[PDB]
Amino acid sequence: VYSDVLALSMRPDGKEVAVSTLKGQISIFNIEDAKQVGNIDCRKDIISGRFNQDRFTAKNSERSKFFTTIHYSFDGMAIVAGGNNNSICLYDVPNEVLLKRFI
Amino acid sequence: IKDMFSSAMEVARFEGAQIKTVSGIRGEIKRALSKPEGHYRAAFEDKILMSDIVILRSW
Amino acid sequence: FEARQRIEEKNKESSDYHAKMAHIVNTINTEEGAEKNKYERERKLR
Amino acid sequence: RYANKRFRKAQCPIIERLTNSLMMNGRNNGKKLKAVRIIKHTLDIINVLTDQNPIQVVVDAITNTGPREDTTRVG
Amino acid sequence: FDRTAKPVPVITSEVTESLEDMIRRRIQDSNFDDLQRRTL
Amino acid sequence: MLRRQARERREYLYRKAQELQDSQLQQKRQIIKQALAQGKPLPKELAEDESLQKDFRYDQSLKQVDDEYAATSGIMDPRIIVTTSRDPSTRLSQFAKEIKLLFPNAVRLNRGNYVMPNLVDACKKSGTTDLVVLHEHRGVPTSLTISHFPHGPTAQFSLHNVVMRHDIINAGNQSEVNPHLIFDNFTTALGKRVVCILKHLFNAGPKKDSERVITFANRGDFISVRQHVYVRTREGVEIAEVGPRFEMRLFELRLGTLENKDADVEWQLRRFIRTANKKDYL
Amino acid sequence: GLKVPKAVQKELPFKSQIHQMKPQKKKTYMAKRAVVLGGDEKKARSFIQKVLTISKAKD
Amino acid sequence: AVPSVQTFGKKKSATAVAHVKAGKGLIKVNGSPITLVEPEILRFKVYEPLLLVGLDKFSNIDIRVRVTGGGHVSQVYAIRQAIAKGLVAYHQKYVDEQSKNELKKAFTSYDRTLLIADSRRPEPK
RNA sequence: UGACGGAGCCAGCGAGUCUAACCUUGGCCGAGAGGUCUUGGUAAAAACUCCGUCGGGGAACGAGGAAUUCCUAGUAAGCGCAAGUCAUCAGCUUGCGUUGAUUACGUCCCUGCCCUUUGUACACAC
């Protein structure tokens, strides 16, 4: 993978592994032949904060633009993802889209 | 080394022996050769020059 | 065979030479120096 | 990476298989450019003589030549 | 003349037997060298 | 991780250098302990001291295997990759097969197109506690290097009077049971280092009634090595020679891993020094 | 003088790097333009060379 | 300033540097048009990005590559790698992220080796 | 499973004022030693790619039996350059590159080898 893969989830099917990486990415690798079947870029849509004591913008910040925990649902359809940022996202896999983003 | 000998017989007799190049660095004579007939190979101390003259003492 | 024989004999001879050398030098030191310090203890007495 | 797990060998395309098995020889080990030129010219001949389609013919040949029941020497 | 290094030994009946008897006696005494567990 | 290897090795060299710089304090505290127990006057230097003289309470509380392996001397099993030189002739490949067989916990690698920096990496990264490299000469074997991958030592031996088992006879098979070990005549500090390396090359704690023994004998600075099977009789013990039988001689010890070629050398076989042949273990 | 292999000189850490400044081939404008005096200035620069060499050998 | 992006490619021991600039719409592997990389059994293994993404995406920009090291097959694989990676890098720096992500998806659909060369590490047993 | 002429193009190791042959005809010089000149004969990146051409060897041999040995991925097998490291290696030795597969990745039936044949660990479960 391009980055370091700091969170790992595995499909109920057990054929696919969803891996969350410090470049703000979630990938989905198929496991019978090891290959990247479907990816979901997240880096953009994370409402990440700026602390009181900081000295830089909450856009240019880079402490909080990766997803650190992942899980599939049980139809093997959706992902819930969360980080050390303000928000929890909920992606839909087959289209690779965001269904919602809470705060 | 090319002229301390003239026959592989001879070098086999004298091999495994101890020589010192005129420069003063030691070394040992180790194995006769084939295609030239009296030349042998020595394993010296450092990179022995072409501009030297190796010697072997004998009584 | 000649190599092994020669190196053996050379080692034995050099070690034996050393042993005799120390034997001698040390016996001169002990005997003579003892009697010399005797004579010196004598001279300082007077 | 077609020979690490059990069946990545299966997942590899067919023409690649044919090319490599073709270069498997006593003095053709290690000339894959020779193997590929060879198979390209073969398929050209295929298309010229049997008009229909090389790849379809190759697949048909492999299926129709696959053996279907073997034996093993008994203990 | 002199020489630079003792040549290699060549094995014989005497060498084989001497080593063999040292081995056999070490067996009779079971005096052994080995890596022991460090337990706990 | 190689960041981590570099830091950990650097720490180690530093710790060793300071142990070297305070062995004299070891000796001085030894003197003070001695006098305190058997009350005798102290020399002038220690007597005038007040810094050590004062702090010598903690150090009074203060207080064998060699160092690099003592971290895991008897805990994990040391596993070994026996690896041929390059483009190996069939006789050499046979020899490497038989050596992998000889050790326990050993596995065999054909060398083609593996360079040493890459092999050393993939080892350090898989965990392969020892590397063996074998060199030949027209099928005959002559060189054997033993490297220890946690940044350890590499002893490059020569090996001469080889006898190959398949060459010997259709002798069947080995016993390949975790063997017993015999080491004779290693005396000097270097001898202890060598026995340490080979021993931790082997496995640990053989079952108290095994059947085969591998023996490393010192004879005139040449190590001999044999394998044997022993079945005990009530009147005596008779054994059968087995495995390779060959004569081996250390000729250098690089404190780095083998690929370094500019590591720190603890010993080397001096063999153009004028008094070469009068002494043992040179 | 010593000379360094390519891996070494391509991997030296920043501060301890080497500075091999390659000769300029295509003659440049200023080096084309500059005048160098003649006659007495010729002889004077010769003389200064000679004097400095002498005093250096002396010291 | 000129919009400008550089990438890399590495097969066995072959380096492939690839500049990508916004310009007149051409492709040059080291001073000679890409139609004349010589192996001729692999020229399409070089084209593979060009074709697989369609041309106009390249009509906008200029790609210059230089390659070294390795040999024939390795250098061809290295160029294809550098071209593809350079294309995606430029389209994620100065052009829209939708092009970025869908290009990455097209490539990883076809064959991931255009993006992450495998550092095919040796293995224990 | 080719030969030959031109083409086409790409490597990685290594950089000690140290790296490197002998016989032979005769000229001149030289007190000599010798020196210079002549002088005749014998020692030491490939493959790959596109175009063109051709279509058994001077008594032995035409890919090497029977048995046995090694091999699972940048691995088998090809192919050339380079170094010669205090042991070993020129009848060679070790590195560094480039080209790059076939087929198991299972089973304990055979062939051996090992083990254990008492849970002692603390649940729930046999």
CSV table of C-alpha atoms in Angstrom, one decimal, chain B:
chain,number,residue,atom,x,y,z
B,1,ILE,CA,57.0,-15.4,-10.1
B,2,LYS,CA,58.7,-16.3,-13.3
B,3,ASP,CA,62.4,-17.2,-13.0
B,4,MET,CA,63.4,-18.6,-9.6
B,5,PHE,CA,62.7,-21.9,-11.2
B,6,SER,CA,62.5,-23.7,-14.6
B,7,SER,CA,60.4,-26.8,-13.8
B,8,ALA,CA,57.2,-27.7,-12.1
B,9,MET,CA,59.0,-30.6,-10.5
B,10,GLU,CA,61.3,-28.1,-8.9
B,11,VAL,CA,58.6,-25.7,-7.7
B,12,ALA,CA,56.7,-28.6,-6.2
B,13,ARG,CA,59.8,-29.5,-4.3
B,14,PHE,CA,60.2,-25.9,-3.0
B,15,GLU,CA,56.5,-24.9,-2.6
B,16,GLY,CA,54.9,-23.8,0.6
B,17,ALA,CA,58.1,-22.1,1.5
B,18,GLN,CA,59.1,-18.6,2.8
B,19,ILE,CA,60.5,-15.8,0.7
B,20,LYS,CA,61.1,-12.1,1.2
B,21,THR,CA,61.1,-9.5,-1.7
B,22,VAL,CA,64.1,-7.3,-1.8
B,23,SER,CA,61.8,-4.6,-0.6
B,24,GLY,CA,61.7,-6.4,2.7
B,25,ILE,CA,58.1,-7.8,2.7
B,26,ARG,CA,57.6,-11.5,3.5
B,27,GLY,CA,55.5,-14.0,1.7
B,28,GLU,CA,55.2,-17.7,0.9
B,29,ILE,CA,55.5,-19.7,-2.3
B,30,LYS,CA,52.3,-21.7,-2.7
B,31,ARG,CA,51.6,-23.5,-6.0
B,32,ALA,CA,53.2,-24.4,-9.3
B,33,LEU,CA,51.6,-23.5,-12.5
B,34,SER,CA,50.9,-25.4,-15.7
B,35,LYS,CA,50.9,-23.6,-19.0
B,36,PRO,CA,54.2,-21.8,-18.3
B,37,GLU,CA,56.4,-24.6,-17.0
B,38,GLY,CA,58.5,-23.0,-14.2
B,39,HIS,CA,56.3,-20.1,-13.0
B,40,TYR,CA,54.6,-20.3,-9.6
B,41,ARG,CA,52.3,-18.2,-7.5
B,42,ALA,CA,53.2,-16.6,-4.2
B,43,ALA,CA,51.0,-15.0,-1.5
B,44,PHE,CA,52.8,-11.9,-0.3
B,45,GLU,CA,52.3,-9.2,2.3
B,46,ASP,CA,51.2,-6.2,0.3
B,47,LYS,CA,50.9,-5.5,-3.4
B,48,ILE,CA,54.3,-6.5,-4.6
B,49,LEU,CA,55.6,-4.2,-7.3
B,50,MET,CA,56.8,-5.3,-10.7
B,51,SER,CA,59.8,-3.2,-10.0
B,52,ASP,CA,61.2,-5.6,-7.4
B,53,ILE,CA,63.3,-8.8,-7.3
B,54,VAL,CA,62.1,-11.6,-5.1
B,55,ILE,CA,64.7,-13.8,-3.3
B,56,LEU,CA,64.8,-17.2,-1.5
B,57,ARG,CA,67.5,-18.0,1.0
B,58,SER,CA,69.2,-21.4,0.9
B,59,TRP,CA,72.1,-23.2,2.5
